[PDB]
């Protein structure tokens, strides 16, 4: 039972922190280093082997042309691996799946229109993998700002024809419309540090004006994202990956 999630997005958006938050919500609090290479972190949780693929952020160069190619390369490498092991010569009953089933795309909360780089990046990934749009560091927005920006992001994904998951043509539609039009993009806060609020140990960030709680729906939507990818839509993510994306890959070969 393998499930593989990738995080991608501009450097400094809290991708690695959210990776740790995902695992920890499911005992030291050391500083998280800037990510230099693509690394697959796997832990066993019925029993599910959850692997999260951390990636070096992009967009930190003067010229960011073709910066998506390392990510595309990794994704295609897992397809090629699965393709080659499908021919189960070893006669194994179960075949290991390292294919990216889900890609969280981190969007910086600028309050303005989506950046051409992100639009191009998402356009590329959307045709090879399931992408889920996430607004990073949601604590940097007020309530009013966040509502406006979520609406703006939805509109701009729509006008640019970015087919993020759940792709409309794969539906349930009552639940999904709620997802595409209300739940997404998930505005998240990450932290693998714990604090005490009203007696409860909670994952959060401690500011001079208050404590931001990661799993508190009054503060952010990390809980909704986690539930979505780990519980309610996990099998569906795997199904679209195998039957649509991987088959698209297989045919292109
Ligand atoms: N305000 C805020 N800061 C956050 C949040 N998550 C992480 N940070 C902080 O943002 C900084 C960068 O986090 P990091 O997880 O390393 O980002 P990254 O996207 O992995 N960077 P890279 O792609 O270079 O490896 C750290 O100081 C971290 O504590 C968040 O939700 N809100
Ligand atoms: Mg990182």
PDB file of C-alpha atoms and ligand atoms in Angstrom:
ATOM      1  CA  UNK A   1       0.000   0.000   0.000  1.00  0.00           C
ATOM      2  CA  UNK A   2       2.073   2.885  -1.337  1.00  0.00           C
ATOM      3  CA  UNK A   3       0.982   6.505  -1.545  1.00  0.00           C
ATOM      4  CA  UNK A   4       3.358   9.164  -2.829  1.00  0.00           C
ATOM      5  CA  UNK A   5       2.983  12.927  -2.426  1.00  0.00           C
ATOM      6  CA  UNK A   6       5.283  15.553  -3.940  1.00  0.00           C
ATOM      7  CA  UNK A   7       5.641  19.179  -2.787  1.00  0.00           C
ATOM      8  CA  UNK A   8       6.722  21.815  -5.322  1.00  0.00           C
ATOM      9  CA  UNK A   9       6.892  25.587  -5.424  1.00  0.00           C
ATOM     10  CA  UNK A  10       9.096  28.642  -5.100  1.00  0.00           C
ATOM     11  CA  UNK A  11      11.942  28.486  -2.570  1.00  0.00           C
ATOM     12  CA  UNK A  12      11.090  29.669   0.939  1.00  0.00           C
ATOM     13  CA  UNK A  13       7.352  28.933   0.881  1.00  0.00           C
ATOM     14  CA  UNK A  14       7.477  26.380   3.705  1.00  0.00           C
ATOM     15  CA  UNK A  15       7.372  23.184   1.633  1.00  0.00           C
ATOM     16  CA  UNK A  16       9.799  21.198   3.807  1.00  0.00           C
ATOM     17  CA  UNK A  17       8.104  22.496   6.955  1.00  0.00           C
ATOM     18  CA  UNK A  18       4.735  21.245   5.649  1.00  0.00           C
ATOM     19  CA  UNK A  19       6.303  17.844   4.914  1.00  0.00           C
ATOM     20  CA  UNK A  20       7.279  17.535   8.569  1.00  0.00           C
ATOM     21  CA  UNK A  21       3.863  18.862   9.589  1.00  0.00           C
ATOM     22  CA  UNK A  22       2.126  16.153   7.547  1.00  0.00           C
ATOM     23  CA  UNK A  23       4.039  13.322   9.182  1.00  0.00           C
ATOM     24  CA  UNK A  24       3.937  14.824  12.675  1.00  0.00           C
ATOM     25  CA  UNK A  25       0.157  15.355  12.588  1.00  0.00           C
ATOM     26  CA  UNK A  26      -0.189  11.650  11.752  1.00  0.00           C
ATOM     27  CA  UNK A  27      10.245  14.423  19.031  1.00  0.00           C
ATOM     28  CA  UNK A  28      12.845  17.138  18.487  1.00  0.00           C
ATOM     29  CA  UNK A  29      12.243  20.505  16.825  1.00  0.00           C
ATOM     30  CA  UNK A  30      15.502  21.119  14.955  1.00  0.00           C
ATOM     31  CA  UNK A  31      15.845  23.773  12.264  1.00  0.00           C
ATOM     32  CA  UNK A  32      14.902  22.566   8.789  1.00  0.00           C
ATOM     33  CA  UNK A  33      17.679  23.098   6.216  1.00  0.00           C
ATOM     34  CA  UNK A  34      17.173  24.663   2.789  1.00  0.00           C
ATOM     35  CA  UNK A  35      16.477  21.822   0.351  1.00  0.00           C
ATOM     36  CA  UNK A  36      19.307  21.227  -2.133  1.00  0.00           C
ATOM     37  CA  UNK A  37      18.264  17.927  -3.727  1.00  0.00           C
ATOM     38  CA  UNK A  38      15.096  15.952  -4.412  1.00  0.00           C
ATOM     39  CA  UNK A  39      14.537  13.631  -1.447  1.00  0.00           C
ATOM     40  CA  UNK A  40      11.860  11.002  -0.856  1.00  0.00           C
ATOM     41  CA  UNK A  41      10.937  10.740   2.829  1.00  0.00           C
ATOM     42  CA  UNK A  42       8.945   7.626   3.685  1.00  0.00           C
ATOM     43  CA  UNK A  43       7.232   6.478   6.873  1.00  0.00           C
ATOM     44  CA  UNK A  44       4.813   3.638   7.592  1.00  0.00           C
ATOM     45  CA  UNK A  45       1.401   4.417   9.073  1.00  0.00           C
ATOM     46  CA  UNK A  46      -4.659  -0.036   7.233  1.00  0.00           C
ATOM     47  CA  UNK A  47      -0.863   0.070   7.017  1.00  0.00           C
ATOM     48  CA  UNK A  48       0.077   2.743   4.493  1.00  0.00           C
ATOM     49  CA  UNK A  49       3.620   3.553   3.398  1.00  0.00           C
ATOM     50  CA  UNK A  50       3.392   7.319   3.038  1.00  0.00           C
ATOM     51  CA  UNK A  51       6.194   8.860   1.010  1.00  0.00           C
ATOM     52  CA  UNK A  52       6.578  12.595   0.622  1.00  0.00           C
ATOM     53  CA  UNK A  53       8.962  13.835  -2.050  1.00  0.00           C
ATOM     54  CA  UNK A  54      10.613  17.101  -1.040  1.00  0.00           C
ATOM     55  CA  UNK A  55      12.000  19.260  -3.840  1.00  0.00           C
ATOM     56  CA  UNK A  56      14.360  22.243  -4.013  1.00  0.00           C
ATOM     57  CA  UNK A  57      12.295  25.375  -4.554  1.00  0.00           C
ATOM     58  CA  UNK A  58      12.561  27.234  -7.850  1.00  0.00           C
ATOM     59  CA  UNK A  59      12.163  30.811  -9.054  1.00  0.00           C
ATOM     60  CA  UNK A  60      15.242  31.992  -7.185  1.00  0.00           C
ATOM     61  CA  UNK A  61      17.273  32.732 -10.310  1.00  0.00           C
ATOM     62  CA  UNK A  62      17.423  35.755 -12.585  1.00  0.00           C
ATOM     63  CA  UNK A  63      16.405  33.540 -15.507  1.00  0.00           C
ATOM     64  CA  UNK A  64      13.997  30.759 -14.538  1.00  0.00           C
ATOM     65  CA  UNK A  65      13.431  29.342 -18.016  1.00  0.00           C
ATOM     66  CA  UNK A  66      13.132  25.539 -18.007  1.00  0.00           C
ATOM     67  CA  UNK A  67      13.402  25.338 -14.213  1.00  0.00           C
ATOM     68  CA  UNK A  68      10.598  22.741 -14.247  1.00  0.00           C
ATOM     69  CA  UNK A  69      12.707  20.142 -16.073  1.00  0.00           C
ATOM     70  CA  UNK A  70      14.298  18.568 -12.975  1.00  0.00           C
ATOM     71  CA  UNK A  71      10.823  18.004 -11.484  1.00  0.00           C
ATOM     72  CA  UNK A  72       9.457  16.650 -14.768  1.00  0.00           C
ATOM     73  CA  UNK A  73      12.508  14.408 -15.010  1.00  0.00           C
ATOM     74  CA  UNK A  74      11.888  12.869 -11.577  1.00  0.00           C
ATOM     75  CA  UNK A  75       8.179  12.325 -12.318  1.00  0.00           C
ATOM     76  CA  UNK A  76       8.909  10.666 -15.652  1.00  0.00           C
ATOM     77  CA  UNK A  77      11.632   8.548 -14.047  1.00  0.00           C
ATOM     78  CA  UNK A  78       9.056   6.982 -11.713  1.00  0.00           C
ATOM     79  CA  UNK A  79       6.763   6.254 -14.672  1.00  0.00           C
ATOM     80  CA  UNK A  80       9.656   4.673 -16.571  1.00  0.00           C
ATOM     81  CA  UNK A  81      10.560   2.607 -13.505  1.00  0.00           C
ATOM     82  CA  UNK A  82       6.983   1.382 -13.105  1.00  0.00           C
ATOM     83  CA  UNK A  83       6.794   0.638 -16.846  1.00  0.00           C
ATOM     84  CA  UNK A  84       9.942  -1.469 -16.642  1.00  0.00           C
ATOM     85  CA  UNK A  85       8.836  -3.332 -13.517  1.00  0.00           C
ATOM     86  CA  UNK A  86       5.320  -3.960 -14.834  1.00  0.00           C
ATOM     87  CA  UNK A  87       6.995  -6.751 -16.781  1.00  0.00           C
ATOM     88  CA  UNK A  88       7.171  -8.642 -13.486  1.00  0.00           C
ATOM     89  CA  UNK A  89      10.051 -10.968 -14.441  1.00  0.00           C
ATOM     90  CA  UNK A  90      10.913 -11.439 -10.753  1.00  0.00           C
ATOM     91  CA  UNK A  91       7.393 -12.879 -10.375  1.00  0.00           C
ATOM     92  CA  UNK A  92       6.639 -10.723  -7.337  1.00  0.00           C
ATOM     93  CA  UNK A  93       3.075 -10.814  -6.009  1.00  0.00           C
ATOM     94  CA  UNK A  94       3.220  -7.113  -5.164  1.00  0.00           C
ATOM     95  CA  UNK A  95       4.985  -4.432  -7.204  1.00  0.00           C
ATOM     96  CA  UNK A  96       6.459  -1.301  -5.563  1.00  0.00           C
ATOM     97  CA  UNK A  97       4.901   1.974  -6.701  1.00  0.00           C
ATOM     98  CA  UNK A  98       7.095   5.091  -6.622  1.00  0.00           C
ATOM     99  CA  UNK A  99       4.886   7.084  -9.009  1.00  0.00           C
ATOM    100  CA  UNK A 100       3.860  10.550  -7.805  1.00  0.00           C
ATOM    101  CA  UNK A 101       0.139  10.209  -7.032  1.00  0.00           C
ATOM    102  CA  UNK A 102      -0.326  13.762  -5.823  1.00  0.00           C
ATOM    103  CA  UNK A 103       1.613  17.007  -6.220  1.00  0.00           C
ATOM    104  CA  UNK A 104       1.010  19.908  -3.853  1.00  0.00           C
ATOM    105  CA  UNK A 105       1.754  23.155  -5.653  1.00  0.00           C
ATOM    106  CA  UNK A 106       2.646  25.969  -3.265  1.00  0.00           C
ATOM    107  CA  UNK A 107       1.502  29.467  -4.252  1.00  0.00           C
ATOM    108  CA  UNK A 108       2.971  32.557  -2.569  1.00  0.00           C
ATOM    109  CA  UNK A 109       0.341  34.791  -0.896  1.00  0.00           C
ATOM    110  CA  UNK A 110       1.123  38.009  -2.766  1.00  0.00           C
ATOM    111  CA  UNK A 111      -2.407  39.366  -2.936  1.00  0.00           C
ATOM    112  CA  UNK A 112      -1.964  39.861  -6.687  1.00  0.00           C
ATOM    113  CA  UNK A 113      -2.485  37.856  -9.888  1.00  0.00           C
ATOM    114  CA  UNK A 114      -0.748  34.477 -10.186  1.00  0.00           C
ATOM    115  CA  UNK A 115       2.823  34.681 -11.487  1.00  0.00           C
ATOM    116  CA  UNK A 116       3.568  33.606 -15.086  1.00  0.00           C
ATOM    117  CA  UNK A 117       6.206  31.222 -13.710  1.00  0.00           C
ATOM    118  CA  UNK A 118       3.664  29.432 -11.514  1.00  0.00           C
ATOM    119  CA  UNK A 119       1.101  29.341 -14.323  1.00  0.00           C
ATOM    120  CA  UNK A 120       3.632  27.813 -16.715  1.00  0.00           C
ATOM    121  CA  UNK A 121       4.885  25.352 -14.098  1.00  0.00           C
ATOM    122  CA  UNK A 122       1.363  24.239 -13.196  1.00  0.00           C
ATOM    123  CA  UNK A 123       0.415  23.937 -16.864  1.00  0.00           C
ATOM    124  CA  UNK A 124       3.347  21.556 -17.369  1.00  0.00           C
ATOM    125  CA  UNK A 125       2.708  19.400 -14.297  1.00  0.00           C
ATOM    126  CA  UNK A 126      -1.075  19.243 -14.717  1.00  0.00           C
ATOM    127  CA  UNK A 127      -0.710  17.061 -17.812  1.00  0.00           C
ATOM    128  CA  UNK A 128       1.623  14.521 -16.189  1.00  0.00           C
ATOM    129  CA  UNK A 129       0.494  14.444 -12.552  1.00  0.00           C
ATOM    130  CA  UNK A 130      -2.388  15.339 -10.202  1.00  0.00           C
ATOM    131  CA  UNK A 131      -1.761  18.868  -8.965  1.00  0.00           C
ATOM    132  CA  UNK A 132      -3.431  20.363  -5.898  1.00  0.00           C
ATOM    133  CA  UNK A 133      -3.099  24.132  -5.448  1.00  0.00           C
ATOM    134  CA  UNK A 134      -2.063  25.289  -2.002  1.00  0.00           C
ATOM    135  CA  UNK A 135      -1.650  28.817  -0.691  1.00  0.00           C
ATOM    136  CA  UNK A 136       1.558  28.845   1.342  1.00  0.00           C
ATOM    137  CA  UNK A 137       2.092  30.677   4.625  1.00  0.00           C
ATOM    138  CA  UNK A 138      -1.600  31.571   4.899  1.00  0.00           C
ATOM    139  CA  UNK A 139      -0.901  33.282   8.216  1.00  0.00           C
ATOM    140  CA  UNK A 140       0.543  36.159   6.209  1.00  0.00           C
ATOM    141  CA  UNK A 141      -3.008  37.076   5.063  1.00  0.00           C
ATOM    142  CA  UNK A 142      -5.879  38.661   6.987  1.00  0.00           C
ATOM    143  CA  UNK A 143      -9.311  37.040   6.705  1.00  0.00           C
ATOM    144  CA  UNK A 144     -10.407  39.549   4.050  1.00  0.00           C
ATOM    145  CA  UNK A 145      -7.173  39.235   2.089  1.00  0.00           C
ATOM    146  CA  UNK A 146      -7.373  35.423   2.149  1.00  0.00           C
ATOM    147  CA  UNK A 147     -10.977  35.290   0.893  1.00  0.00           C
ATOM    148  CA  UNK A 148     -10.144  37.677  -1.964  1.00  0.00           C
ATOM    149  CA  UNK A 149      -6.958  35.829  -2.917  1.00  0.00           C
ATOM    150  CA  UNK A 150      -8.564  32.369  -2.886  1.00  0.00           C
ATOM    151  CA  UNK A 151     -11.248  33.713  -5.228  1.00  0.00           C
ATOM    152  CA  UNK A 152      -8.635  35.349  -7.454  1.00  0.00           C
ATOM    153  CA  UNK A 153      -6.536  32.162  -7.604  1.00  0.00           C
ATOM    154  CA  UNK A 154      -9.578  30.051  -8.565  1.00  0.00           C
ATOM    155  CA  UNK A 155     -10.532  32.502 -11.309  1.00  0.00           C
ATOM    156  CA  UNK A 156      -7.031  32.622 -12.764  1.00  0.00           C
ATOM    157  CA  UNK A 157      -6.538  28.841 -12.710  1.00  0.00           C
ATOM    158  CA  UNK A 158      -9.825  28.718 -14.603  1.00  0.00           C
ATOM    159  CA  UNK A 159      -9.062  31.341 -17.278  1.00  0.00           C
ATOM    160  CA  UNK A 160      -5.664  29.770 -17.980  1.00  0.00           C
ATOM    161  CA  UNK A 161      -7.213  26.312 -18.349  1.00  0.00           C
ATOM    162  CA  UNK A 162      -5.151  24.683 -15.615  1.00  0.00           C
ATOM    163  CA  UNK A 163      -6.625  21.239 -14.979  1.00  0.00           C
ATOM    164  CA  UNK A 164      -5.847  20.724 -11.301  1.00  0.00           C
ATOM    165  CA  UNK A 165      -7.239  17.796  -9.300  1.00  0.00           C
ATOM    166  CA  UNK A 166     -10.084  17.018  -9.081  1.00  0.00           C
ATOM    167  CA  UNK A 167     -10.305  17.484 -12.839  1.00  0.00           C
ATOM    168  CA  UNK A 168     -13.963  18.308 -13.572  1.00  0.00           C
ATOM    169  CA  UNK A 169     -14.361  15.480 -16.093  1.00  0.00           C
ATOM    170  CA  UNK A 170     -13.585  12.736 -13.560  1.00  0.00           C
ATOM    171  CA  UNK A 171     -16.719  12.751 -11.392  1.00  0.00           C
ATOM    172  CA  UNK A 172     -19.898  13.290  -5.821  1.00  0.00           C
ATOM    173  CA  UNK A 173     -19.997  16.347  -8.098  1.00  0.00           C
ATOM    174  CA  UNK A 174     -21.776  18.091  -5.223  1.00  0.00           C
ATOM    175  CA  UNK A 175     -18.827  17.270  -2.975  1.00  0.00           C
ATOM    176  CA  UNK A 176     -16.281  18.077  -5.706  1.00  0.00           C
ATOM    177  CA  UNK A 177     -17.827  21.402  -6.726  1.00  0.00           C
ATOM    178  CA  UNK A 178     -17.570  22.321  -3.065  1.00  0.00           C
ATOM    179  CA  UNK A 179     -13.884  21.335  -3.333  1.00  0.00           C
ATOM    180  CA  UNK A 180     -12.978  23.186  -6.546  1.00  0.00           C
ATOM    181  CA  UNK A 181     -15.037  26.284  -5.720  1.00  0.00           C
ATOM    182  CA  UNK A 182     -14.776  26.562  -1.929  1.00  0.00           C
ATOM    183  CA  UNK A 183     -12.118  24.287  -0.412  1.00  0.00           C
ATOM    184  CA  UNK A 184      -9.393  24.911  -3.007  1.00  0.00           C
ATOM    185  CA  UNK A 185      -6.875  26.349  -3.020  1.00  0.00           C
ATOM    186  CA  UNK A 186      -6.143  25.093   0.505  1.00  0.00           C
ATOM    187  CA  UNK A 187      -4.701  27.951   2.540  1.00  0.00           C
ATOM    188  CA  UNK A 188      -2.169  26.318   4.830  1.00  0.00           C
ATOM    189  CA  UNK A 189       0.210  26.995   7.706  1.00  0.00           C
ATOM    190  CA  UNK A 190       3.065  24.626   8.475  1.00  0.00           C
ATOM    191  CA  UNK A 191       4.942  23.964  11.704  1.00  0.00           C
ATOM    192  CA  UNK A 192       6.584  20.987  13.359  1.00  0.00           C
ATOM    193  CA  UNK A 193       6.909  22.939  16.610  1.00  0.00           C
ATOM    194  CA  UNK A 194       4.361  22.362  19.388  1.00  0.00           C
ATOM    195  CA  UNK A 195       2.804  24.811  21.851  1.00  0.00           C
ATOM    196  CA  UNK A 196       0.159  24.873  24.589  1.00  0.00           C
ATOM    197  CA  UNK A 197      -3.232  26.444  23.927  1.00  0.00           C
ATOM    198  CA  UNK A 198      -5.924  26.098  26.591  1.00  0.00           C
ATOM    199  CA  UNK A 199      -4.075  23.064  27.935  1.00  0.00           C
ATOM    200  CA  UNK A 200      -3.800  21.291  24.574  1.00  0.00           C
ATOM    201  CA  UNK A 201      -0.464  20.490  22.890  1.00  0.00           C
ATOM    202  CA  UNK A 202      -0.892  21.787  19.346  1.00  0.00           C
ATOM    203  CA  UNK A 203       1.277  22.216  16.264  1.00  0.00           C
ATOM    204  CA  UNK A 204       1.781  25.918  15.703  1.00  0.00           C
ATOM    205  CA  UNK A 205       3.795  29.094  15.228  1.00  0.00           C
ATOM    206  CA  UNK A 206       4.368  31.454  18.160  1.00  0.00           C
ATOM    207  CA  UNK A 207       4.279  35.169  17.309  1.00  0.00           C
ATOM    208  CA  UNK A 208       4.585  38.171  19.678  1.00  0.00           C
ATOM    209  CA  UNK A 209       0.861  38.853  19.153  1.00  0.00           C
ATOM    210  CA  UNK A 210      -0.407  35.274  19.374  1.00  0.00           C
ATOM    211  CA  UNK A 211      -0.120  31.587  18.530  1.00  0.00           C
ATOM    212  CA  UNK A 212      -1.119  30.339  15.072  1.00  0.00           C
ATOM    213  CA  UNK A 213      -2.575  26.819  15.290  1.00  0.00           C
ATOM    214  CA  UNK A 214      -1.892  24.560  12.295  1.00  0.00           C
ATOM    215  CA  UNK A 215      -4.793  22.142  12.796  1.00  0.00           C
ATOM    216  CA  UNK A 216      -7.323  24.803  13.868  1.00  0.00           C
ATOM    217  CA  UNK A 217      -9.869  25.468  11.107  1.00  0.00           C
ATOM    218  CA  UNK A 218     -10.411  28.963  12.529  1.00  0.00           C
ATOM    219  CA  UNK A 219      -6.799  29.733  11.582  1.00  0.00           C
ATOM    220  CA  UNK A 220      -6.013  27.749   8.437  1.00  0.00           C
ATOM    221  CA  UNK A 221      -7.046  24.864   6.192  1.00  0.00           C
ATOM    222  CA  UNK A 222      -4.183  22.409   6.730  1.00  0.00           C
ATOM    223  CA  UNK A 223      -6.648  20.025   8.404  1.00  0.00           C
ATOM    224  CA  UNK A 224      -8.831  20.047   5.277  1.00  0.00           C
ATOM    225  CA  UNK A 225      -5.827  19.412   3.028  1.00  0.00           C
ATOM    226  CA  UNK A 226      -4.579  16.519   5.160  1.00  0.00           C
ATOM    227  CA  UNK A 227      -8.039  14.925   5.312  1.00  0.00           C
ATOM    228  CA  UNK A 228      -8.447  15.360   1.558  1.00  0.00           C
ATOM    229  CA  UNK A 229      -5.196  13.729   0.432  1.00  0.00           C
ATOM    230  CA  UNK A 230      -4.806  11.096   3.165  1.00  0.00           C
ATOM    231  CA  UNK A 231      -8.389   9.950   3.725  1.00  0.00           C
ATOM    232  CA  UNK A 232     -11.176  10.961   1.348  1.00  0.00           C
ATOM    233  CA  UNK A 233      -9.417  11.210  -2.027  1.00  0.00           C
ATOM    234  CA  UNK A 234      -6.315   9.017  -1.655  1.00  0.00           C
ATOM    235  CA  UNK A 235      -7.593   6.055  -3.678  1.00  0.00           C
ATOM    236  CA  UNK A 236      -9.059   8.363  -6.318  1.00  0.00           C
ATOM    237  CA  UNK A 237      -5.695  10.141  -6.673  1.00  0.00           C
ATOM    238  CA  UNK A 238      -4.016   6.774  -7.216  1.00  0.00           C
ATOM    239  CA  UNK A 239      -6.682   5.747  -9.757  1.00  0.00           C
ATOM    240  CA  UNK A 240      -6.308   8.840 -11.933  1.00  0.00           C
ATOM    241  CA  UNK A 241      -2.521   8.491 -11.752  1.00  0.00           C
ATOM    242  CA  UNK A 242      -2.576   4.877 -12.944  1.00  0.00           C
ATOM    243  CA  UNK A 243      -5.434   4.934 -15.463  1.00  0.00           C
ATOM    244  CA  UNK A 244      -4.920   8.411 -16.955  1.00  0.00           C
ATOM    245  CA  UNK A 245      -1.458   9.912 -16.379  1.00  0.00           C
ATOM    246  CA  UNK A 246       0.589   6.701 -16.439  1.00  0.00           C
ATOM    247  CA  UNK A 247      -1.329   5.488 -19.492  1.00  0.00           C
ATOM    248  CA  UNK A 248      -0.639   8.807 -21.195  1.00  0.00           C
ATOM    249  CA  UNK A 249       3.026   8.198 -20.392  1.00  0.00           C
ATOM    250  CA  UNK A 250       2.890   4.586 -21.590  1.00  0.00           C
ATOM    251  CA  UNK A 251       1.374   5.596 -24.936  1.00  0.00           C
ATOM    252  CA  UNK A 252       3.846   8.436 -25.502  1.00  0.00           C
ATOM    253  CA  UNK A 253       6.700   5.924 -25.217  1.00  0.00           C
TER     254      UNK A 253
HETATM  255  N1  LIG B   1       4.851  32.564   8.323  1.00  0.00           N
HETATM  256  C1  LIG B   1       5.155  31.284   8.025  1.00  0.00           C
HETATM  257  N2  LIG B   1       6.421  30.900   7.954  1.00  0.00           N
HETATM  258  C2  LIG B   1       6.539  29.582   7.659  1.00  0.00           C
HETATM  259  C3  LIG B   1       5.539  28.661   7.425  1.00  0.00           C
HETATM  260  N3  LIG B   1       6.069  27.413   7.136  1.00  0.00           N
HETATM  261  C4  LIG B   1       7.360  27.589   7.192  1.00  0.00           C
HETATM  262  N4  LIG B   1       7.718  28.879   7.514  1.00  0.00           N
HETATM  263  C5  LIG B   1       9.073  29.390   7.637  1.00  0.00           C
HETATM  264  O1  LIG B   1       9.512  29.703   6.330  1.00  0.00           O
HETATM  265  C6  LIG B   1      10.936  29.424   6.212  1.00  0.00           C
HETATM  266  C7  LIG B   1      11.194  28.486   5.038  1.00  0.00           C
HETATM  267  O2  LIG B   1      10.620  27.195   5.283  1.00  0.00           O
HETATM  268  P1  LIG B   1      11.017  25.947   4.408  1.00  0.00           P
HETATM  269  O3  LIG B   1      10.095  24.880   4.861  1.00  0.00           O
HETATM  270  O4  LIG B   1      12.465  25.736   4.606  1.00  0.00           O
HETATM  271  O5  LIG B   1      10.734  26.370   2.941  1.00  0.00           O
HETATM  272  P2  LIG B   1      11.009  25.577   1.631  1.00  0.00           P
HETATM  273  O6  LIG B   1       9.847  25.842   0.765  1.00  0.00           O
HETATM  274  O7  LIG B   1      11.232  24.164   1.977  1.00  0.00           O
HETATM  275  N5  LIG B   1      12.349  26.181   0.970  1.00  0.00           N
HETATM  276  P3  LIG B   1      13.257  25.479  -0.165  1.00  0.00           P
HETATM  277  O8  LIG B   1      12.366  25.199  -1.349  1.00  0.00           O
HETATM  278  O9  LIG B   1      14.400  26.423  -0.427  1.00  0.00           O
HETATM  279  O10 LIG B   1      13.873  24.260   0.454  1.00  0.00           O
HETATM  280  C8  LIG B   1      11.365  28.906   7.582  1.00  0.00           C
HETATM  281  O11 LIG B   1      11.836  29.995   8.356  1.00  0.00           O
HETATM  282  C9  LIG B   1      10.056  28.347   8.141  1.00  0.00           C
HETATM  283  O12 LIG B   1      10.018  28.262   9.547  1.00  0.00           O
HETATM  284  C10 LIG B   1       4.194  29.085   7.498  1.00  0.00           C
HETATM  285  O13 LIG B   1       3.174  28.413   7.318  1.00  0.00           O
HETATM  286  N6  LIG B   1       4.094  30.438   7.811  1.00  0.00           N
HETATM  287 MG1  LIG B   2      12.767  22.919   1.506  1.00  0.00          MG
END
